[PDB]
Amino acid sequence: ATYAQALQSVPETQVSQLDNGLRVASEQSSQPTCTVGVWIDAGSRYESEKNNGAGYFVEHLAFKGTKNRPGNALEKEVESMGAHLNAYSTREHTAYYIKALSKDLPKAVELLADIVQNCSLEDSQIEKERDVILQELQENDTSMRDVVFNYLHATAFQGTPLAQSVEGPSENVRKLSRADLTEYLSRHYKAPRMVLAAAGGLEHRQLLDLAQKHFSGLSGTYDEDAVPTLSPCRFTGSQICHREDGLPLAHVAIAVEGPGWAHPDNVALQVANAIIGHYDCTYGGGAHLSSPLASIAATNKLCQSFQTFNICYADTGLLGAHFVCDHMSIDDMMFVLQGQWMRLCTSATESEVLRGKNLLRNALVSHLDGTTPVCEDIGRSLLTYGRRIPLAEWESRIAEVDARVVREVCSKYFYDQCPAVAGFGPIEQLPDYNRIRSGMFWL
Amino acid sequence: QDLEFTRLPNGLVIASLENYAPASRIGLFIKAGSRYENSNNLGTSHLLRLASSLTTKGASSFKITRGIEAVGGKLSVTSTRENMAYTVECLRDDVDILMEFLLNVTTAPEFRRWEVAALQPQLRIDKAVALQNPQAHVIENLHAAAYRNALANSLYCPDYRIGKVTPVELHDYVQNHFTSARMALIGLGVSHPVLKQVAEQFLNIRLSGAKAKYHGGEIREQNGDSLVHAALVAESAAIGSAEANAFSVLQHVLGAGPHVKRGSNATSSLYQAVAKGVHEPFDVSAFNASYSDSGLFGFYTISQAASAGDVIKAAYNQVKTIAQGNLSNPDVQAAKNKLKAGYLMSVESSEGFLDEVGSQALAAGSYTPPSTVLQQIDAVADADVINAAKKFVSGRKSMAASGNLGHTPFIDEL
């Protein structure tokens, strides 16, 4: 068979709704396993400075006590069932989910009602986690990469709630109350701004009954002025630097304003990042690689690792890169990086486009090799774009992309803009913001 | 769709499973791990694990690295003390290219003199990234202490060996271990006659290894880290034997690893047993390793300096209780639900699936579907689960540890 034939043969996802507001969807497939979760709209961007870090602090107590399954009972009905259980927060979204088998599913979904709705939040545990949190802020100091983005988001989105961390400052965590949790919990966990999804071994109507069974009692409404909408988070062009000469290496990042989720040119930008790409000190390609940014850094050994990205938030995002290099080589890398963007905004060879197009296809696909990646993409799609996108729709959008579009897109979002810069380490050579911007436009 | 599975006169397995997926995928599982490295040619597989992307006869090191990236595929090399996979990926519209790149790696590597020279000091980085994760020189010394001849050969290469590897010391290896009698041109997302074509045209070509003679021994690494790591094992059995499936369930009986994110691991008999008396950080779990000739079983430690003995003497005492009959049935049938899951969940992804379709094909010669395994988990005996631990306790012991070792005991003090 062929490619275009393949995406047609893919299971077309299914959708449903409940009277309270809880969207539901799923995707049938022949995998005996499955995985189910609750991908919602709640995090630090909604926190204010007084309840900051809440969206993470809840995440430890949900699996540590309820009303109908207190103590380690909830933790015992999974292990005894033989499934995995998992969660993760963000700055906007949030998610709890399970990896379990098909036949044991009707028990899984029962629990999430006992978790999302009926978390008991006993005080003896609240004090323990209040110490555990202050153990991981110590750890993430060592997760030097994540320190950078926490600095990056903190600058370009200064003044907004979005500059906040996820776990919150150490101060608020030593001041947070049950009521703030109760008040935070009692507002965001609401059916219209929630989702359920799963795939693997199930049918969509094995499931719709079960949320009609368990989640039907959820608070599908609110006091008329209680559920806020968003503020447009502006963008700043600003630099931040945590000068530290004593450490081995310097983690660095730069980025600009992103367009947002809905804006279709994200399909353009993911190509451009793919054109640039990534490298970390182990790929056997070396000089013979294709991305000039890689072959140089392999040739001249300027750096040890770097990666691009594309973060996308409500009506904006972040586009840029992160790189790690010895102190005597920062300024050299930045010239090359900036050299490529100007090259792409100006002279994007068609032969180099088909690479990134063909690179991107083998991301989204290979990303969706399993159930858990699928069920992320579902539960994330139903709060970002709305509809999930069948992959033969992405493909058509991509084949529209030619070298004419890139030169327009990158002109709009790179050229002459007001970037945001971050630095953590021996950055004695890190050039000033003005020199960065002057290096932003060719000629 | 169902799984073809065949065999040539040369002993070359094939497979194929045309799932009508967009993303094609291939694997070529081969028996060339570190075990077949004798005393002279140590660390050669480590180099050969990087030797991908190098020159061939059908194309250069350059053409490969560009043709692949154009279509958008990959070229990964998973490798073990037994096996040496050359996995890839692609879009199925462009398989006929990437196949040609592949077999030119294996069937026609030149291994020129100079490209090696650039490639050696890469090892000092590769070897170094791993040991940021301290397990993989704890775990290596086990095979170094426990076993003697073949499986003791670490995946990675000793330091002094770098700078000194010879190309002839690859040609001799390739011409002795990349042999059509012990290979497996697995496929996926792709049809069967296609692979049957290519193998008969390029792989239609023609050493052995000694057995893992267990010894029993202990190695120590006082290396200034703030924590402790330690592993304590005993002779297991190989795979295929139903004696295996008693260990692999006894794993989850005893310590499985966290199934709940940030969980207290309540049902783990071992971790729970530590939680009384101990009131400081720790973590601990079972270690099961099942190679074709032999294996190991035991557990792995994480603790502070002073509290190494006070943790290990929970594990050892606990497992004795598991050997002295003190046990229940629901723990097992609960533990099986874990084992029956991780197998399926592992083969959820095409890759993790692909890791198992062929790993059987080399040691065994037939693909066992998941269902037939789950029977073998149901037919397990609670007199094998016990034995099992009786073999562990009564059995000779191998051990290793890393960190601060001022309060860490030997075997005999247990």
Binding site: - | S53, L75, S79, D126, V129, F287
Partner: peptide, 17 residues
């Protein structure tokens, strides 16, 4: 855990367990 090696041409080199 039964550690396994992995390098590549484009996947970051890693240590499965």
């Amino acid at each position: 855990r039964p550690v396994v090696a992995s390098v590549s041409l484009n996947v970051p080199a890693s240590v499965r367990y």
